[PDB]
Amino acid sequence: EVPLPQLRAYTVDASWLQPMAPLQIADHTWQIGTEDLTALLVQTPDGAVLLDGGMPQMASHLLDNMKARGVTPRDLRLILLSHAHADHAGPVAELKRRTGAKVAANAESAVLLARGGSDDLHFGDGITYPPANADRIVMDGEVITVGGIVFTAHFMAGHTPGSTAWTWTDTRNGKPVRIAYADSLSAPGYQLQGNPRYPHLIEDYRRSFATVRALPCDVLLTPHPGASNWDYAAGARAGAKALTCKAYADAAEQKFDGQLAKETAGA
Ligand SMILES: CC(C)c1ccc(Cc2sc(N)nc2C(=O)O)cc1
Ligand SMILES: [Zn+2]
Ligand SMILES: [Zn+2]
User: Fold this and answer.
1) Which of 52, 210, 241, 244 has a 20 to 30 Å separation from 250 between CA atoms?
2) Which cysteines in this chain are paired by disulphide bridges?
C-alpha cells in the first residue's frame, strides 16, 4: 500500500529557504537564490552564467528570478559549482532539463554530481540528490570566457575533494570589481586524522586556507552567506559587513585547528 511518492516524510522548517528577489551585487552579477543560500547569476551579452543553485526544490524559484532579470530558459548557458553537495548543486539536473544550460566542473565535482552526492566521503548515502552529468571538465587555473566575462577556477579541496573557488571581474560604479566566490572551508563533524577515505585531508585544508587568503578579492561571496557575514535580506546593506578573503580563511583555520585539537586529545 501507499504510493512511492507518499512513503517519505521530509523534515521541513518553514524558516528554511526563504525566497528573495534578485539582489544586485555588481553591474552584471546578482544573487537570485534564497536568503540562506547563494545562487549567483551573471548576465552577459552572450548568455547567462549561474554559479550554484542551492537545494533541489529551488529550481522553479531560480527560473522565476531569471525571468525577472530577462533571462529566458534558452539564455542560461553555463552552470558552475562551488561543491557538489545537495544544498548547492541540488537543482542542477532539473535546471539542465528545463534550460539550455551546460555544466563545467572539475573531475572530483563531476564524479560526485554524476552519482547525485551518494557515497559521500563523510556522510555516506544520507545526502543524495538528483544526479547530473558534466558537459566540460576543468583543470585548476582554467579560464572560461562568456560574453567577455572571464571566470577562473581555483581548486580548494577539503570540504569536498572537488571544492572550487571561482573568480571574475565585474564593474561597479565604473571601477572594475574583483569578485571571488569561495567555497566552504568547514569540516563539520568530519574525521580529520586517519580518515581512510581522505588520507591527506589535513594537508588539503591547509593549502586551501592559503589559496583562499590569496585570491584576487575585492568582494568575497560564499555558498552559505553567513560564512562570509553577508545578510541577503538587508537589501542595499547586504554586503556591509562582509569578510575579506583573508579573514574568512583565518576564521576557518582557527576553527579547524580547534577541531583538530579536540579530536587529538585523549579520552
Ligand atoms: C556548528 C555546526 C552546527 C556547523 C556549522 C557550520 C557548518 C557548515 C555547513 S552546514 C551545511 N548544510 N553546509 C555547510 C557548508 O559548509 O557548506 C556545519 C555545521
Ligand atoms: Zn557541503
Ligand atoms: Zn552547504
Assistant:
1) 52
2) 217-245
Looking from the CA of residue 85, the nearest atom of ligand 1 is: 17
Residues with active-site annotation: 83, 85, 87-88, 159, 190, 224
Ligand 1, residue 186: give the atom nearest the CA. Answer: 16
Triad 122, 124, 125: Cα angle to 5°: 145
The amino acid occupying position 253 is E
CB hemisphere CA count around 72 (13 angstroms): 2
Specify the CATH number for the domain of residue 21.
3.60.15.10
Q: How many domains does the chain have?
A: 1
Known binding residues for Zn(2+) are 83, 85, 87-88, 159, 224
Q: What is the resolution of this structure in A?
A: 1.8
Structural domain including 260 reads: 4-264
